Curated annotation (Swiss-Prot), chain A:
Induction: Expressed in the late phase of the viral replicative cycle. This is Major capsid protein. It is found in: Virion. Major capsid protein self-assembles to form an icosahedral capsid with a pseudo T=169 symmetry, about 190 nm in diameter, and consisting of 1680 major capsid proteins trimers. The capsid consists in 5040 copies of the major capsid protein (hexamers), 60 copies of the penton protein (pentamers) and 1800 minor capsid proteins of different types. The minor capsid proteins form a hexagonal network below the outer capsid shell, stabilizing the capsid by binding neighboring capsomers together. Myristoylated at the C-terminus. Glycosylated; highly branched oligosaccharides. The pattern of glycosylation sites are unusual. The viral capsid possesses up to five major capsid protein variants. They behave as asymmetric capsid components. Belongs to the NCLDV major capsid protein family. It comes from Paramecium bursaria Chlorella virus 1. It comes from the Viruses.
Length: 48, 63
């Protein structure tokens, strides 16, 4: 049975963990994103 | 007959009292619930539209 034995042997102690699910772990959510670019350059050093 | 008249008088008084106390209003407040999981997933924006701009043109150069 594998994962089905664990999945099926459900009890009261699980209600607090899986009842009325609020989240899904196998389908994530992406936050609003803005396009970025990075550049690395030299600065001038004033002095010896 | 007079007893009938007085009884009708007091009955009409109390009926008028009932009608005047009948019109008191009632108020409704809205309670907002979070969306269910399945409805949320069905409403969720596809990543192809949330951050498609990551390859729009560029950021160091215009279009």
């Amino acid at each position: 049975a594998g994962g089905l034995s664990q999945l099926v042997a459900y009890g009261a102690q699980d209600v607090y963990l899986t009842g009325n699910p609020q989240i899904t772990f196998f389908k994530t959510v992406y936050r609003r994103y803005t396009n970025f670019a990075i550049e690395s350059i030299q600065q001038t050093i004033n002095g010896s | 007959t007079s007893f009938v008249l007085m009884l009708l008088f007091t009955g009409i008084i109390l009926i008028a009292t009932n009608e005047l106390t009948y019109n008191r209003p009632r108020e409704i407040q809205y309670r907002y619930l979070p969306r269910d999981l399945d409805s949320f997933i069905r409403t969720q924006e596809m990543p192809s539209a949330i951050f498609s701009s990551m390859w729009d043109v560029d950021t160091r150069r215009g279009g």
